[model samples]
Target: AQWKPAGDRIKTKWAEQINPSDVLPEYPRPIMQRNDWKNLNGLWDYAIIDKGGRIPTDFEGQILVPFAVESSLSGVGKRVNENQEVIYQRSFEIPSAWRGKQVLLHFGAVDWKTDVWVNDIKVGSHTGGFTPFSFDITPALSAKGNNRLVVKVWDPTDRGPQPRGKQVSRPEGIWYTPVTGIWQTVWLEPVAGKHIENLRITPDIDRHLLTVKAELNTNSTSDFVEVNVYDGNQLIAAGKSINGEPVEVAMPENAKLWSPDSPFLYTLKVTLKEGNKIVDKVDSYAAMRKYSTRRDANGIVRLELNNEALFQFGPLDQGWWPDGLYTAPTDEALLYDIQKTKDFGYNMIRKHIKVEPARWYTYCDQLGIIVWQDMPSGDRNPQWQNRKYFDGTEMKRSAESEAYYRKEWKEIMDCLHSYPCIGTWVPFNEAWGQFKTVEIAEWTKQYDPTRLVNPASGGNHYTCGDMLDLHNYPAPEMYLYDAQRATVLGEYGGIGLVLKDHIWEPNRNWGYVQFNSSKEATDEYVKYADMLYKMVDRGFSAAVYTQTTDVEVEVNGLMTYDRKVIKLDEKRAKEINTRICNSLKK
Candidate 1:
């Protein structure tokens, strides 16, 4: 109930097991590797007060860092509802040896808007809650005593026009409980003045070239960017250019290509060089793979990986935790779903309406899973109609509102460029706040041509996008598939089963097709599998199951929400899916 505190009644298995002292201990950023870093994840003193409240002289209690105020893992186990401001405070000392380098504080992501301070000095604030933003706190830190770090956070949830996906103040069937304050790993790194702020690595297998673009904090007059390409111990190719410019290095002709079957990756070491001295350094990796739409032997449009047609099938992964809310309890818990999805004989995962931490994408690159990453949907405009042909009307989003959306989208793309797992970029889902369809599609294609762009999946049919996707219930169906656009049943087959001991709530457990028995669900799943294979033969490129697992009150999942029960027969699912996937080759 709204009157009662959220995350109080339901405690996920992960919430019960997480150690407050050692929560989510893994290195957050795997692509941009750095050895000199500190994890600020454990516990932080936090207090929740109204928006009018002063910076509290006293903290009410410890609200776990990274976990939102509404999450059960968060010591608070309550909601940051009302027009409220949540304040977080912690103190740390600079390592004596780290004094020479610039100290950078990085937040993986916070909800809505956040303000940061070091020893009462306002360092900087980040407005984007889904994308990473960092501030150099070198000047604010003192050389002598312990330094204090304080964070002020505010979230409007459904109250404002922010791009919060599936979150709401009043939770219901589809709308989930709101998340506020910190929801991802927060850490600090030591880098030089001309540190590598971002890295974009794109691989062209056709040209045997690896293009690199390094965005830096401050361009030093003496610094030149040096990029070293490595194939294991052997340094295959290297390039040198200005810090801000693009550097292209030609790889060996016999270099291995990256694919789902053989997911090979090359190491890229970037350094800022001031003459012979290495001023800044960061290690990253990328793969030689391409995701494009092309015509097959039958003149049917299909998804191609490395210039060959391939059928990508996976569940729509929501990346939600019952206890942690938006945040996963532990790093292992975070990757558990990915591993399980692979075990279910899937090659792709449609990350629906949520941006995960960088490490999530890192695992996808390393573990050989294709990702169709979705931008979180919010603030729908009723003025815009959902149809194949634009009725000449679009969302009436304010310029400021649209600016934030565009800015965040660009930042998300820029942030994930280092990894090779992302095969497609989904800008909008089901026309949720969708606007300027042609413009968004054009920009997405222009910005990154390597990955296929799905402009809007299953919402309104549009002329844009490389694929025409649909969302169906109980079975695989595409009512308006066209030859020009690759046909994809984006979402289908939600078969529900209530497990004995596992559920987010006692009631309101549902699926598209409700089944009382596991046998029934499996039978229906097999039937859907056969239907999907027929659709595949009819030029369907890909199909995503409604979800990877049951979430919240939604009982329709391949596995139960707590991950305790397999709702469908895994062996049966694997056999059917694996057989259908190979038909794409023919």
Candidate 2:
């Protein structure tokens, strides 16, 4: 693969400050913390080889870990095709201090499928993309010397029915370049032979209790689990459970409830013990929050958080960066997007068709931002002609694809379930990869009954979830809600403004409705927001503006692609947003 400068006009001003060694140096997983770990995010030897070809005798150059190959920060600004295989090689020495513990290698995410080799010994293989996977490498690691690691990745992009959201071989019209290889943090953690495999944290706000489920290794017994919950430094609840137990703690007199307005978290310290001797420990945290649908003063059902009715106003956050497609250039850059949304007075963000790093959600948890998460859509396109004949043509899925999608979706939900910031789970968006939506949505609701579920957002509503979502581009629109379902405008108002110097393509830049200047964009934004206020009186409980920031060729965003410019008037936008909240209260 080769790197190329597209044009002088597309150069990012912040490109010089990105240091791979120092990039995203914070602990990748903020929800779960282990003291002993080493990051593998710096430069690594990489190559693009033919499928099934042997490892190259030599490598092309160093590619930054976690940043996609298409990103300039990856050091290989090139595209990976269906016929090519992306390979990565790196070496690390076991620290002299960590000589006796078992070493576990981890990859946050990789596209499509991946094969791993440790010290030339085949370690493991993983299927599916966009989820975390790991392997125990203690047997393969050399105690006194350096250890080698190699990864081979193959991504079909649009050629296959994988859960690749908006990634295409040829970028055009709502599609961007394919992300291959490592697009997330890689790391190593040392643990004992019999250690905790996973933890499931559930909070019961009504009961003032939290449940902790500790899963152990296959060979391990259930007698080694101890769970403790803390409010600040004081221990409030402690218990010993074999497989799992529900530990109850009384709510403090001034107990903090988590919401978009104020997110408060409680610390958790878990220890795995073998007959009173601690073998392993990890630190984590959770928040006391609840998301449900309840009747308001006017007898209309609205989305509720912490048992109180609150209208969720947010933007459609299509978690993509101009420089780094899937991964943000830095952790601060990731947090900045969420913070800026809050600064603009929006309380929620609809994570449109992408699952971000756990740290991103943790930031949302700490910063008081609500999240509406969408499961990434997959499968082939629906027939346009069938749309007129079938009203909302519901395509059927093969059993294998359905099972795979369900498995991956369950894993994704499991990975993110503990976060207090997430308020809704969207099964399908606009009928893309939507099949058995009603059944799936019901299953999701049953799986995690704590959160609200929007079965099919925007279109193809089978009336299975908590909200009836509608999407209208360039104008505000509403769909009347059933007595049981809350009404929400899932997407609306894409007022585009393409700055002369900041553009991915000069001739191809687009939006739902294009605007010429910043003033025009801001005026249209306020006008549309005002329209939403009028509809709030008409039973619309939530509204999501088109987007948070501009993507590659999509120019409709509140901020420019580089995040250096805000295209709308901040004060005016805040006034309009606050008016929305005030109108909902009325």
**Candidate 1 local lDDT, 1-586, one digit each (tens):** 0111235454555666777667788888888888888878877888888987899857757877888898777767777764898899998877777878899899999988899999999999987778998999999998786889999999888877778888988888767878888999988889877778888888888888888888777676666888898888789899888636788888888888887667788888988777778877888887888778788888899998888889999998887777787887777877888888877788889988889998898888878899998888777654433335446456678887788789888988888766788988898887788887779989988998888888788866678879888778878875776789798888888888888578878888778888789998899999998988888878789989978878788878887776767788888888887876676875
Where does the lowest 10-residue lDDT sum fall in candidate 1?
1-10
- Cα-lDDT of candidate 2: 0.81
lDDT string, candidate 2, 542-585, tens digits: 99998898888888989888788888888899998977865655
List of clashing residue pairs for candidate 2: none
User: Residue 334: error of model 1 in Å?
Assistant: 1.1
Candidate with maximal lDDT = 1
> Which stretches in model 1 have alpha-carbon errors above 4 Å?
1-13, 383-393
TM-score of each: 0.96, 0.95
Q: In every candidate, how many clashes are there? A: 1, 0
Clashing pairs in 1: 430-459
